[PDB]
Amino acid sequence: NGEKERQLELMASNRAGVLSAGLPIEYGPLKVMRISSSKNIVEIMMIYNTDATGAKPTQELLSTSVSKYCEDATVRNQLDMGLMYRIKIRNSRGQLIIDEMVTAASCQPQ
Amino acid sequence: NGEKERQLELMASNRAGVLSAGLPIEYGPLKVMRISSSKNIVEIMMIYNTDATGAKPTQELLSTSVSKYCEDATVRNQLDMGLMYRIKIRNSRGQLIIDEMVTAASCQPQ
Amino acid sequence: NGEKERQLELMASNRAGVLSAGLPIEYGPLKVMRISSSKNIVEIMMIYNTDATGAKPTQELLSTSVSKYCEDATVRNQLDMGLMYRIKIRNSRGQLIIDEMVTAASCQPQ
Amino acid sequence: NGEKERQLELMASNRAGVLSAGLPIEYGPLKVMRISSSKNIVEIMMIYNTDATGAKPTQELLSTSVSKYCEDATVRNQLDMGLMYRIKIRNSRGQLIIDEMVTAASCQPQ
Ligand SMILES: O=S([O-])[O-]
Ligand SMILES: O=S([O-])[O-]
Ligand SMILES: O=S([O-])[O-]
Ligand SMILES: O=S([O-])[O-]
Secondary structure (H helix, E strand, O other), rough: HHHHHHHHHHHHHHHHHHHHOHHHHEEOEEEEEEEEEEEEEEEEEEEEOHHHHHOOHHHHHHHHHHHHHHHHHHHHHHHHHOOOOEEEEEEEOOEEEEEEEEOOHHHOOO | OHHEEEEEHHHHHHHHHHHOOOOOOOEEEEEEEEEEEEOOOOEEEEEEHHHHHHOOOOOHHHHHHHHHHHHHHHHHHHHHHHHEEEEEOOOOOEEEEEEEOOHHHHHOOO | HHHHHHHHHHHHHHHHHHHHHHEEEOOOOOOEEEEEOOOOEEEEEEEOOOHOOOOOHHHHHHHHHHHHHHHHHHHHHHHHHOEEEEEEEEEEOOOOOEEEEEOOOHOOOO | OHHHHHHHHHHHHHHHHHHHHOOOOOOOOOOEEEEEOOEEEEEEEEEHHHHHHOOOOOOHHHHHHHHHHHHHHHHHHEEEEEEEEEEEEEOOOHHHHHHEEEEEHHHHHO
16 A cells, blocks of 8 residues: 555654664674664664774674664564665775665565 | 767776875864765765754855865866866764755856 | 771772773773773773764863863762862873873862 | 892883873774783783673683783883883773783792
8 A cells, every 4th residue: 555655655764763862872893873864764873893803704793783683572562564674884994895685574584 | 079978987987096095184174084986076974063062054064165175276276177076964863954966167256 | 997998999989990891982082991990090091083073082081071170060069078189191003191180179260 | 139120110111201192002802902011010901802702711811911011022121120110901892801910029939
């Protein structure tokens, strides 16, 4: 429906607002800098501190992104209802190194 | 021409690359975090440290943006050739507070 | 008295504790990183962001230190009772550039 | 000798200077903020990012301090000659959580 799409867009906007108020927040070498929405997508922008780690663990950042969002009760409900999360991770130079959609399908077996 | 547009797009991409290598760089309460390009536009993303200043001097940020880009010899040449700069400034929460194009016209009397 | 010295030492320790809980806090190009006590002295350690300003305004940092502590109602009372503040400011390299006692006498005419 | 003590004090001062020029530098959740000397001691002050980790791994910070300084060719030579390193680690609040001497004896079996 148009009404279900409208509801998801309003949910994505509200949830981006809620999460924005607490920024920036660090989780080890990740610093969450910016949260936005677009349609039914919550966009999470983080700096991965390449300067501090001397590493670029792309595989690990992706696998831990999928598992952490999927295992969060609130995000998992949101995904199943039709919200999607877009995870953008930049290195210390601000260069984009990960740009990955997490959807309800991401959490399912395949 | 198609060739002049192609040249400006290649210039915007190269110049975004050059400036990215030095990031992040601070200019008082501004921290330049990310530089990108799109077509003939160099996009400059900065955090204005609202937490540290307790202020939101929107007028000042805009007037000093126009004057600083216009008065830079290299940027002024680039603007006159057809490159444009897009200045995006976020507060401490990552919320967008300025999104302003600077073009060759920005430097002229009116 | 021994008892008045003991009271001032306990006050300096408690006040260092109170202020520590809120750190780090920025005031423009100053970042308060560490607060300690020693006897009747509250020690305030800040980084002055020499990298961001490209300046070392020693005179200004000293005059604004004396005036800001002297004009604060709580600090002014504390100073008059016999507490002292030691202001240590380091540059971006962590090198000590100011180490200045502020006492009750600092606020008086001379 | 007085001359060997003087040589170690001059070495500690010079080495503190050398290391200061590169600050701040991050090694994962450690940020080296300040390096000083006192007599034959190089003092290393770091922030351990308790806010980002949600942990206080005191044992690990101490064991990895001893092993990293002992296993560094230059530091190991310096220690054997009579220089000592004092490792001070503060949490996110600037509160001192580790203050540990590393000496030539630290690297030996016992
Ligand atoms: O890693 S996801 O499938 O839970
Ligand atoms: O402020 S611009 O017109 O130089
Ligand atoms: O500057 S002090 O004397 O208030
Ligand atoms: O851990 S130290 O003994 O090399």
